[PDB]
């Protein structure tokens, strides 16, 4: 399972999309997810993390 940040922000405004971004940061800190960004300003991919064994679809 994986989640694209840019796809989660598809139909958002500036304040909403910033909050989805900030939430990847928080979730990463809690080790609910792992994070990949191939190069600056590319899409950011969330992958399952150690301290959460459910659905990424659930988390968001």
């Amino acid at each position: 399972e994986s989640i694209s940040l840019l796809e989660l922000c598809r139909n958002t405004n500036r304040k909403q999309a910033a909050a989805k971004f900030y939430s990847f940061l928080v979730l990463k800190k809690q080790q609910a997810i792992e994070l990949t960004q191939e190069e600056p300003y590319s899409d950011i991919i969330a992958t399952p993390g150690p301290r959460f064994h459910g659905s990424l679809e659930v988390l968001f």
Partner: protein
């Protein structure tokens, strides 16, 4: 004059080799509570020549990742700044930790710190004066200065206090320092206060007490808030007193202005009554007068940025920080 990116290798929690940016004209640095964000404040101060004692360590070597617990990740670490300039090639300024001592480099030329500082000075960056930096709580410190110490700050900036000893042992020079600095600050202060508080029914005035011997007496500062009558700044209350202090601080930095401005949690001192206002001011200024790099806690501030650099921690023996980049300009404006 543009800070294009920062490159870090094994500096504090920034383990390994990491690119920070590229920056836009208005970039905000954000993330959950941790040392990650302030360590990046420290990296900027470091590549701009800051003394070890202001970098929260006792020894240079301790800035190497892992070194505080005697588990250093490498024998060296560095911070590099890429400075870009239209019509010219990029210029890279690096400070490298080698042999427990700083090695300064400009485009792979090892240089003495004195030449490093001169070359930055030609770019408008004053690394002793730190014209590019607004440190945490700088707004509060400004807000609580009586006219005599408002002068004390000005002679610090204007080098009037430099000449203080040979003068008072006896003088045209000490005046030129103050007023060329002061009148510059006073020239711009009325427009900046009119811009922070959005309506033009605002006014702010900067007058010396000793109009032709100002280095001696205090400096008066009188405002005109909208829903108020003309009264000095000392007789202001909180929410609007802060906006008056911001105008003073920004006007100070608009004399000998740096090409970029690093604001370290300036939105800490802001309410829902003015945070959106100050944030639009920074946005408008970043299109022309200076590049803004802000470290911010409040969504109502950093959603005005064009770019977000978001800091996050990785698990390790030591705190590890990494960054993500996010473009906000692709999305519709909110309210």
């Amino acid at each position: 004059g543009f800070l294009k990116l920062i490159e870090i290798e094994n500096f504090k929690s920034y383990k390994g080799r990491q690119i920070i940016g590229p920056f836009q004209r208005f970039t905000a640095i954000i993330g959950p509570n941790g040392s990650g964000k302030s360590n990046l404040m420290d990296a900027i101060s470091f590549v701009l020549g800051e003394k070890t004692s202001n970098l929260r360590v006792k020894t240079l070597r301790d800035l190497i990742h892992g070194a505080p617990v005697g588990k250093p990740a490498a024998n060296r670490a560095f911070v590099s700044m890429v400075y870009s300039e239209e019509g010219a090639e990029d210029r890279t300024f690096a400070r490298v930790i080698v042999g427990g001592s700083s090695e300064y480099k400009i485009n792979n030329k090892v240089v003495q710190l004195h030449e490093y500082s001169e070359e930055l000075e030609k770019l408008g960056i004053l690394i002793k004066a730190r014209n590019f930096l607004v440190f945490q709580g700088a707004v509060e410190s400004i807000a609580m200065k009586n006219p005599k110490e408002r002068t004390a700050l000005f002679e610090e900036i204007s080098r009037s206090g430099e000449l203080a000893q040979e003068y008072d042992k006896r003088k045209k020079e000490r005046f030129d320092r103050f007023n060329a600095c002061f009148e510059s600050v006073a020239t711009n202060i009325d427009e900046i206060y009119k811009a922070l508080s959005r309506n033009s029914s605002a006014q702010a005035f900067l007058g010396p007490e000793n109009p032709e011997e100002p280095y001696l007496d205090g400096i008066n500062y009188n405002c005109v808030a909208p829903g108020k009558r003309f009264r000095p700044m000392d007789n202001l209350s909180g929410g609007e007193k802060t906006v008056a202090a911001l105008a003073l601080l920004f006007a100070i930095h608009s004399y000998k202005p740096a090409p970029f401005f690093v604001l370290d949690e300036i939105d800490a001192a802001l309410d829902n009554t003015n945070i959106g206002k100050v944030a639009n001011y920074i946005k408008e200024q970043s299109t022309c007068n200076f590049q803004a790099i802000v470290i911010s806690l409040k969504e109502e501030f950093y959603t005005k940025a064009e770019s977000l650099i978001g800091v996050y921690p990785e698990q390790g023996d030591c705190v590890i920080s990494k960054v993500l980049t996010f473009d906000l300009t692709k999305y519709p404006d909110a309210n």
